[PDB]
């Protein structure tokens, strides 16, 4: 009909790599995000930013490389290539960690585009959008952790830097400063991811070892009817198995599969809320009743008190080279340490 | 001959389950790869080997195996002649070509099956006798081998005895413990702290002695199987098939793999700290030795020193009363070692010997072993995870122990997997539930 | 089971393909190589050369300390180097 | 009586039992009841345990000041190391509870039973005519409990270094582990998180794809679940519509159409990944730790140029330097 | 069939294909820098 | 920011006279220092006796002075206690005891000079790091 419907027509055309309206947002961003990372990983440094070598060009390996956050001076600045900081200049932008907000913000839109895609492709193919609902979980994580979090802190500098090792310190930090492992929400988080990776494994095996024989071969893979018809595995046998070994067992594939969506998506949602709270530093650091008894009574010791001391050490020995902008100077005598070590 | 209408590509080797001949090429070609390695690696080690430097500081794991059998070494594990190393290496490397020949031959030219090209070699998995017999042949070959060691030790040269009276040295064992009460005693030993089971072997007589028993006991069973068939239970108990037999041998290796991991990690005797590194406990012990030795020279009375907790900076007591080194090292009070024994009394570390019988060679032994504990990183950076780069080293004992726990493990999975397959294969459902006769459907509802 | 695109398999096998890419691929490679080896990359990304982290004596870090006059501050850091 | 024992064996092995007490079960059921019963009592009323062998009792039970999150069953003493400490090895229970005896009684019975639990996951599959291997999936989580409760202690020389039985006690095991082994920088742990992250990921993929491509048979105001009856002949979702959507999300050949290959992958991934994670802990149990890139990148003069690998080392030193305050008397931590 | 050349798939394939090799080339070169 | 010959100029003897090492000797020392020292002196400390380090000042107050090529060299041949009132060649690697510490057999006067030079050059580059321990890592 008209240019719009013709533009549409073209886009929604069934190619090898479906484009679609969504693609107009997805691909530009998704590629820029992936690109910026791959660029910084090998070329840009984090010297003027964290006093750290962070690229292959400097000597870092796939584990130690990363696109480090901007200085703490920048604050929450969007750090646009043409903004007050970089001032249109590219190299400076690079040295001021412009590549972080670049990857961050771009990838962010890229996750919007992608979920939209699922939504758009779902609609076309005429299937229900539970693949999109599910993907809300990963959005929440990215949003709360790479955006909401540092937005509550002093600046982007405390957001997780893009890189393998550069993420491990994000972990260690959270233990040491937020005592994050003791947080009810992080726990739910893991219960879901850990519990989700169980349903995955357990359901898979239950199916492969509860299959009907539809072939004469040993390699039963070929024996499958790509064109529906009968259930390829004995749902009835599976039920009896677990009902006798675990005591409880599914018996409604519709529920067994919905459950599998729920468990890990709910888990990640919870782990997000916990972090949205760590933004304001509203952590789950201590148990007051415990601290009070530990003060008055020097012989009371739990695996909890023990941990808190591990945190003190993490904070004292890391803070210096981890928060350069604070020009920390901790005399050897002030550094907490046990005996001998 | 055999393609996809046998098994899937990635399960290819199972297409040889019933082609005795070709299934022989595999085993003969494979056994070639092991000799090839053993040989080719030894020369690699020797090519890098530096005489005047610890073996453990050179990433060696074969030369130290030869050294233990008393070859190219002398007083204290000093390397004398590198020839036996070069020899053992090249010889194997050659035999690899011979075997490899046969393998390739039997797998792509010779008979694809054996039963007809000679009924002696051809075989039938369910042939309880052929099986019991071939097993019997191998049970003898292994038995001779066990004696091949007893010989090298008693007649041909000896073995490296670190406990050597005059101090570590190659010694000829001419008095193997044959007393069954003792030999087999080991098997009745706890596998926990202190009583360590097999790994507690601590002198060459038992090693040699015990191997004498195994060699005989082994060949004896080799003849017995040659001359027999499984009884009744032996038959109503096991599964008789190509896979089932495999499985049984899989679980067997797994177990030997775990036992080996602990031997190289704990044992001091058959794994001399002189060629490998100091044991885990041995190194923690040496730190205590080192500092009790140091501070004592500065005028400290080790016997009465009180540490932060009020337990005893240098010396404390174990749960059953014996005097041991203090500190976290209290967990390794079961460590025994040439260098440290002369300080032990009838009640454990003697405060008088510690006070004036410590010898320099011991002080530097303790120092050496202290600074060569089995702590290191994947990229080989010796020390604690927080250490700095410089000393490129990872104890041979760490390498061996980890590699073999992984292998030992996966093999236990291998066992479960091939055993699970064999039981379903036998009864016959390893390809799916009979759409028609679905067993579960004939059973009452537990409800 | 199909769309317009010419089945990769066919292309990765066409002698035309290799006749084209045997030229193109190494082309791109040698280019990037030179990008690094000519020191150009260092300037495109303000990344320090092994001899440009600190001034000879100084052992302090060139930490950018304020957003707006950042670029200016960075430039001055390059001034001590040499 | 067709023969008592003959009968017994028919019951035990009976596939008509609500819960299949198998042959492996005969060992499982008792060991697991002991482990469970001892734990629950311990966790609630056990008194302080001198975990580090330095006479500095760590109380970890509810009645002694702990809450669910902090409370735990504390590991046997370090004075004990790897020695066997059965109740009949103590002058009294008072002595046994002080040296952390309950810990061993629990870990040993649990590990024992949890293995038979695997042996059972095979047996029932056999008595039911289904293919084995499910028990092989369960070998991963088991191989972990083993690594964390036995291998690591054997390797380290003491049961006091095994993972405690409690929430916070576990975080302790982790935080310290990291300090002494730098696990986050080890290939095996990474494969572990790939498997776990991936699992949860895939678990969500499958779960959604399927649930979203279900054939309509339900009302607008009726649980979409009822559209399935236990004991159906044909499938309850359009696996061809599922593949149709997912193939377009990414691209066709990068999408499953074979339910069997889908489900194998679904099981293979996590199990394989966790297998490596378990081998990681079992490997770092002999001190072959993660990559140590401390002071790798250095400049033209020799100055040390830090990488994130170094910022990680500081955080590790803090842990090293503060764990086990009073347990060390010497320079190097070789235990 | 009479398949075309420059297609949408082609574009994509190159957006990732081209840069990659350019990087693999860059990196391969770094392996020789020193001090 | 480089290892100039200006940095490789370290005191040769007690009477102020100096010597200038070359980037070859340096690297060579560094390699030798790893081959026969790191084991116990990694990063300038001393694992089997943390009280004595290789910090130049520590070596300055040693007895005799061991903060110059001549000094360290003598030491690597005939080692003594910090007051020099006792020879320790029996429990410390040295030339007069290579039979006991093989790693010291190859070592020739050329090598001893490099190792010595490294010890005086390192702190010049690393500074506080060289002496202190984990606190500075
Ligand atoms: C469901 C199915 C799942 C399937 C999963 C399959 C997973 C398969 C994992 C397979 C293999 C893991 C292999 C590990 C190899 C380790 C090699 C190594 O340790 O090699 C060590 C060497 C050496 O490192 C070097 O170590 C060196 C020095 O040591 C020393 O050397 C110096 C002199 O040169 C001095 O003497 C010094 O004192 C001494 O200590 C230097 O420090 C170097 O600077 C340092 O770079 O390794 C290096 O450089 C290494 C750079 C390494 C990058 C490594 C990545 C490793 C694993 C990644 C897994 C990713 C998974 C992703 C999954 C995604 C989706 C599933
Ligand atoms: C599904 C989800 C899809 C998401 C898609 C997202 C797409 C784009 C996201 C864009 C994010 C922009 C963030 C802007 C920002 O951070 O902007 C930050 C600035 C405020 O900046 C801060 O200001 C601070 C200083 O305040 C102090 O100093 C000031 C003078 O400098 C004044 O004196 C002030 O009164 C005094 O308190 C510091 O300078 C900080 O360094 C500086 O970053 O403006 C402002 O935020 C205006 C903010 C509107 C915020 C909306 C927030 C939403 C969630 C927030 C959670 C917080 C926790
Ligand atoms: C793969 C696995 C491969 C295994 C391969 C081979 C194993 C061989 C074992 C031989 C064992 C003999 C024995 O064992 O004997 C075993 C003992 C009985 O032990 C002995 O008890 C003895 C002492 O009684 C006495 O000694 C005391 C002082 O020590 C007091 O004086 C006391 O009054 C006095 O009566 C000593 O304490 C011994 O040291 C102690 O070992 O119990 C025990 O082993 C209990 C063992 C429990 C194992 C629990 C495993 C849990 C999960 C396993 C998963 C495996 C896969
Ligand atoms: C349970 C736990 C089990 C743990 C087992 C751990 C290790 C088993 C190792 C076997 C190693 C053979 C290594 C080798 O030959 O190692 C060689 C080198 C060694 O480098 C050398 O390392 C040497 C030294 O080691 C040693 O030397 C030192 C003295 O120099 C000390 O003696 C020290 O203790 C000793 O170990 C020297 O430092 C050299 O200078 C240095 O160059 O490293 C390398 O090779 C690194 C190679 C990395 C390969 C990475 C592959 C990554 C991904 C593959 C994916 C396949 C996927 C298939 C998927 C299919 C379907 C999905
Ligand atoms: C490690 C040892 C090993 C061995 C000994 C074998 C042996 C064998 N395999 Mg496997 N296989 C292996 C590993 C191994 N395989 C692995 C890792 C995989 C997974 C990729 C497979 C997958 C597989 C499949 C899918 C199939 C086999 C089959 C076979 C048989 C094939 C006969 C044939 O067609 O020859 C063909 C041989 C050639 C074309 C050339 C090979 C030459 C080899 C022998 C040597 C190369 C070395 C060197 C050049 C020789 C120098 C020798 C020296 C003395 C001079 C044979 C007995 C087939 C079968 O089961 O049939 C019943 C089959 O279908 N295998
Ligand atoms: C590791 C096990 C192994 C086994 C079980 C076999 C088994 C067999 N082989 Mg091989 N073979 C092997 C390894 C093995 N081979 C290797 C490594 C090579 C390469 C060197 C060969 C090369 C080979 C060839 C070229 C031929 C066979 C043949 C045969 C079959 C002969 C049956 C027959 O008709 O009567 C023959 C009776 C015998 C072969 C037994 C006599 C063995 C004597 C000659 C040598 C024993 C070895 C050694 C010298 C003893 C140690 C002495 C000590 C002092 C050091 C038989 C099934 C033949 C065949 O295909 O038949 C159908 C054939 O032509 N094999
Ligand atoms: C090297 C491999 C090897 C292999 C594969 C076999 C295999 C076999 N042998 Mg044999 N044997 C061997 C070496 C070997 N033997 C040697 C060297 C000797 C000389 C002593 C013998 C002497 C021998 C005799 C005298 C007999 C067999 C028999 C049998 C068959 C027994 C079936 C059975 O139920 O066993 C499984 C064993 C059991 C079910 C018993 C349970 C024992 C419990 C108490 C402990 C199990 C171990 C424990 C859980 C962990 C280890 C503890 C540690 C302290 C040992 C079987 C096919 C029997 C047969 O029928 O021969 C024709 C028979 O009577 N063998
Ligand atoms: C000790 C002897 C042993 C023997 C003789 C066999 C023999 C056999 N196994 Mg088996 N297995 C073993 C141990 C053993 N296994 C162990 C310890 C495990 C636990 C992991 C398994 C797990 C296992 C499974 C899960 C399966 C088999 C299968 C099979 C059959 C496969 C046919 C084939 O084509 O190979 C296939 C070989 C390959 C496809 C090669 C790929 C190997 C990959 C997975 C790992 C490579 C590891 C290497 C170290 C990595 C280096 C990479 C490099 C780039 C650096 C065959 C009869 C298959 C079957 O159908 O059995 C009836 C099957 O599905 N096995
Ligand atoms: C084409 C389409 C591509 C689409 C998606 C691509 C995703 C690509 C990721 C690439 C990571 C590259 C890392 C790299 O190049 O490192 C290059 C580095 C740097 O190596 C270092 O280089 C320095 C100089 O720059 C010095 O020479 C150092 O000494 C040297 O160690 O990496 C390695 O050595 C890596 C070993 C990496 C093993 C990685 C496995 C990664 C698996 C990822 C996903 C698996 C499924
Ligand atoms: C294509 C999609 C683009 C999206 C945003 C593009 C923004 C471009 O913004 C524009 O970049 C050029 C450099 O290329 C800058 O030009 C500036 O940087 C260069 C270096 O790169 C300096 O030599 C120059 O003196 C300076 O003015 C402009 O000041 C800036 O306004
Ligand atoms: C049947 C729907 N297709 C499909 N494809 C894929 N492909 C990967 C690579 C994610 C396993 N996964 C799923 S969910 C297990 N489904
Ligand atoms: Mn619980 Ca492993 Mn840090 Mn020595 Mn104790
Ligand atoms: Ca230079």
Curated annotation (Swiss-Prot), chain B:
Residues 1-34, 120-141, 240-254, 436-447 are cytoplasmic. Binds multiple chlorophylls and provides some of the ligands for the Ca-4Mn-5O cluster of the oxygen-evolving complex. It may also provide a ligand for a Cl- that is required for oxygen evolution. PSII binds additional chlorophylls, carotenoids and specific lipids. InterPro entries: PS_antenna-like, PS_II_antenna-like_sf, PSII_PsbC, PSII_PsbC_sf. GO terms for cellular component: photosystem II; plasma membrane-derived thylakoid membrane. It is a multi-pass membrane protein. The chain crosses the membrane at residues 35-57, 98-119, 142-164, 219-239, 255-275, 411-435. Keywords: Chlorophyll, Chromophore, Manganese, Membrane, Metal-binding, Photosynthesis, Photosystem II, Thylakoid, Transmembrane, Transmembrane helix. It comes from the Bacteria. The keyword Thylakoid applies. GO terms for molecular function: chlorophyll binding; electron transporter, transferring electrons within the cyclic electron transport pathway of photosynthesis activity; metal ion binding. GO terms for biological process: photosynthetic electron transport in photosystem II. It is found in: Cellular thylakoid membrane. [CaMn4O5] cluster binds at residue 341. Pfam families: PSII (PF00421). Residues 58-97, 165-218, 276-410 are lumenal. Belongs to the PsbB/PsbC family. PsbC subfamily. This is Photosystem II CP43 reaction center protein. It comes from Thermosynechococcus vestitus (strain NIES-2133 / IAM M-273 / BP-1). The lineage of its organism: Bacteria, Bacillati, Cyanobacteriota, Cyanophyceae, Acaryochloridales.
From Swiss-Prot, chain D:
The record marks 152 as: Tyrosine radical intermediate. Residues 1-22, 124-133, 209-263 are cytoplasmic. Chlorophyll a PD1 binds at residue 189. Chlorophyll a ChlzD1 binds at residue 109. Coiled coil: none annotated. CDD domains: Photosystem-II_D1. GO terms for cellular component: photosystem II; plasma membrane-derived thylakoid membrane. It is a multi-pass membrane protein. InterPro entries: D1/D2, Photo_II_D1/D2_sf, Photo_RC_L/M, Photo_RC_L/M_CS, PSII_D1. The keyword Metal-binding applies. It is an enzyme of class 1 (oxidoreductase). The D1/D2 heterodimer binds P680, chlorophylls that are the primary electron donor of PSII, and subsequent electron acceptors. It shares a non-heme iron and each subunit binds pheophytin, quinone, additional chlorophylls, carotenoids and lipids. D1 provides most of the ligands for the Mn4-Ca-O5 cluster of the oxygen-evolving complex (OEC). There is also a Cl(-1) ion associated with D1 and D2, which is required for oxygen evolution. PSII binds additional chlorophylls, carotenoids and specific lipids. A quinone binds at residues 206, 255-256. GO terms for molecular function: chlorophyll binding; electron transporter, transferring electrons within the cyclic electron transport pathway of photosynthesis activity; iron ion binding; oxidoreductase activity, acting on diphenols and related substances as donors, oxygen as acceptor; oxygen evolving activity. Residues 45-101, 155-182, 287-335 are lumenal. Disulfide bonds: none annotated. Its EC number is 1.10.3.9. It is found in: Cellular thylakoid membrane. Fe cation binds at residues 206, 263. The record marks 181 as: Stabilizes free radical intermediate. [CaMn4O5] cluster binds at residues 161, 180, 323-324, 333, 335. The chain crosses the membrane at residues 23-44, 102-123, 134-154, 183-208, 264-286. It comes from the Bacteria. NCBIfam families: psbA. This is Photosystem II protein D1 1.
Curated annotation (Swiss-Prot), chain E:
The keyword Metal-binding applies. Keywords: Acetylation, Electron transport, Heme, Iron, Membrane, Metal-binding, Photosynthesis, Photosystem II, Thylakoid, Transmembrane, Transmembrane helix, Transport. GO terms for molecular function: electron transfer activity; heme binding; iron ion binding. It comes from the Bacteria. Its main location: membrane. It is a single-pass membrane protein. It is found in: Cellular thylakoid membrane. The chain crosses the membrane at residues 8-32. Its cofactor is heme b. GO terms for biological process: photosynthetic electron transport chain. With its partner (PsbE) binds heme. PSII binds additional chlorophylls, carotenoids and specific lipids. Heme binds at residue 14. GO terms for cellular component: photosystem II reaction center; plasma membrane-derived thylakoid membrane. Residues 33-35 are lumenal. This b-type cytochrome is tightly associated with the reaction center of photosystem II (PSII). PSII is a light-driven water:plastoquinone oxidoreductase that uses light energy to abstract electrons from H(2)O, generating O(2) and a proton gradient subsequently used for ATP formation. It consists of a core antenna complex that captures photons, and an electron transfer chain that converts photonic excitation into a charge separation. Belongs to the PsbE/PsbF family. This is Cytochrome b559 subunit beta. It comes from Thermosynechococcus vestitus (strain NIES-2133 / IAM M-273 / BP-1). The gene is psbF. The chain holds residues 11 to 45 of 45 of the full protein.
Curated annotation (Swiss-Prot), chain F:
It is found in: Cellular thylakoid membrane. It comes from the Bacteria. GO terms for cellular component: photosystem II; plasma membrane-derived thylakoid membrane. It is a peripheral membrane protein. Its cofactor is heme c. Binds 1 heme c group covalently per subunit. PSII binds multiple chlorophylls, carotenoids and specific lipids. Disruption phenotype: Cells do not grow photoautotrophically under low CO(2) concentrations. Heme c binds at residues 41, 92. Transmembrane segments: none annotated. GO terms for biological process: photosynthesis, light reaction; respiratory electron transport chain. Its main location: membrane. Keywords: Electron transport, Heme, Iron, Membrane, Metal-binding, Photosynthesis, Photosystem II, Signal, Thylakoid, Transport. GO terms for molecular function: electron transfer activity; heme binding; iron ion binding. Belongs to the cytochrome c family. PsbV subfamily. PSII is composed of 1 copy each of membrane proteins PsbA, PsbB, PsbC, PsbD, PsbE, PsbF, PsbH, PsbI, PsbJ, PsbK, PsbL, PsbM, PsbT, PsbX, PsbY, PsbZ, Psb30/Ycf12, peripheral proteins PsbO, CyanoQ (PsbQ), PsbU, PsbV and a large number of cofactors. It forms dimeric complexes. This is Photosystem II extrinsic protein V. The lineage of its organism: Bacteria, Bacillati, Cyanobacteriota, Cyanophyceae, Acaryochloridales.
